[PDB]
């Protein structure tokens, strides 16, 4: 057989169907969302991490002359001074008043501990979801994964139950972010090949390890110092670092709906939201034929006691005749209250009591045995308890909180003197022909 | 050490501490709102609950009170004028039969 | 690139240009490759066959 049905996005919390067949019992459909698991497209744009400058040795001409060229390397700067007298502890190595030169060069490449300190900046796009959900039909138990797209059915026993698509779509993600040891921070990172001294990203790479490399951070080199050969070199902090102190607080602690999200799939897991469409194909043979089920006579509904509350604190009773010995389904028809139990043993004039939980302390609704239903009204109270974490609002209300009691006092309310209008409209019209005779 | 207030939704809120795994607390309602048959004041369970939505009900009771008070009383009036005033009658005289009825 | 943030390093002279005043795109959201040729096509979803 085939059935649909929406559900909200919500873990761990079985939802009670049926699937009405004239000639056959009607059957318990259990629908339990396992876990999400939310998976956006990513795209990889460049690395970074702390930098290490290099002072190599440098181009020192005795009585000559040099230039300044060029290179490849990152952050390449080269410079240039004359009439230079270096020393050392042998003493002085050269000195010619004006033809002496030295030249000095400066690049940068990433830490040897960035291997494990590198961060990474991500492109990401179109989130896509993937749920995995536990079905039960007929004490037939079923463990399904499937992507909420409306074309792909998941494959669990063959059979194939199509959902979604999801009803309004979330994504605590920016289409930029930044990863760092196992963290993700919501970030808008620059262009590759752009950056800016003292900023977040002055260094790039494709690779952890490619060669190639580019920066910017303001390296410009200062002039030889009294005496001494040094290479006096300046240049601004690393943006890495700076962005660390105030990089904010992970998105671990700031997105809605309680995700939990990793980082090797770059994924939220579950994080709930939304309501999802679901089509059902079912086997004809987990079906039973009525008759084979048993029949119920002349059941009564009775409320032992219930608290309004969070938990199935609803508590009812039912006394029932039966020609016929096996089990049957139960079901509240009214969403506002759902059950706890799928079915139980059944008896020729046996009773049983039953727990439930309801979105409305008003506990006036109809609920099925088998193929037939009773009614069930009551009233319900608020508890003392009023913080826990549990699964709670099962039901979202339906502004059927409103009491019986205040529908009473409301309908007497209204009043209805534009009757009293009318009539007194009326008579006026008589008296007015009446005093037209004269 | 000291004591914090955090304001917890309907919904669900989510609760960080230490370096152990967190715990999840949510909340609902408890003011005494349904009444027992008798005489009470549940408005104020439904102030403690969406104070939108709730006094909205009360404003428009009002409305509807006074716009039935006002032309139920107008249009009698207006009727009880128009009998009277080409009757062009007095209180407590003869011709007044129908006023017998009226007043 | 033609995004106004990056200048292209060219003799260290930053020259900065776009963003683009109308975008193009060939590409539809979904392609197939093969054998050196691009084919524009919408392919079903991975698991949907
Ligand atoms: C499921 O219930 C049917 C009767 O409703 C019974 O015949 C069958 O053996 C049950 N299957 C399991 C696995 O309990």
Redesign the pocket.
Known sequence: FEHATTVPNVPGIPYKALVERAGYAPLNLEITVVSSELTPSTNKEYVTCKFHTVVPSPQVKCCGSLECKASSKADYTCRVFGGVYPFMWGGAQCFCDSENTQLSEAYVEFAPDCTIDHAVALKVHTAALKVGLRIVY???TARLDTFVNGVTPGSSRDLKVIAGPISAAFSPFDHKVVIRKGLVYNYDFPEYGAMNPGAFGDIQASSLDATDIVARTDIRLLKPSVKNIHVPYTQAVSGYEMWKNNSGRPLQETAPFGCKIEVEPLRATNCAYGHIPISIDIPDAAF?RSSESPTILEVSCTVADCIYSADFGGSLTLQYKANRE??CPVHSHSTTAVLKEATTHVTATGSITLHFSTSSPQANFIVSLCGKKTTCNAECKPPADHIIGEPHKVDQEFQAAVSKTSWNWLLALFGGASSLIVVGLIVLVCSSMLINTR | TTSRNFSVGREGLEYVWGNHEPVRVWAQESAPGDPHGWPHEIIIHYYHRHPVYTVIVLCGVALAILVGTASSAACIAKARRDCLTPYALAPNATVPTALAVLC
């Open positions: 007929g004490n037939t039973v096996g089990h």
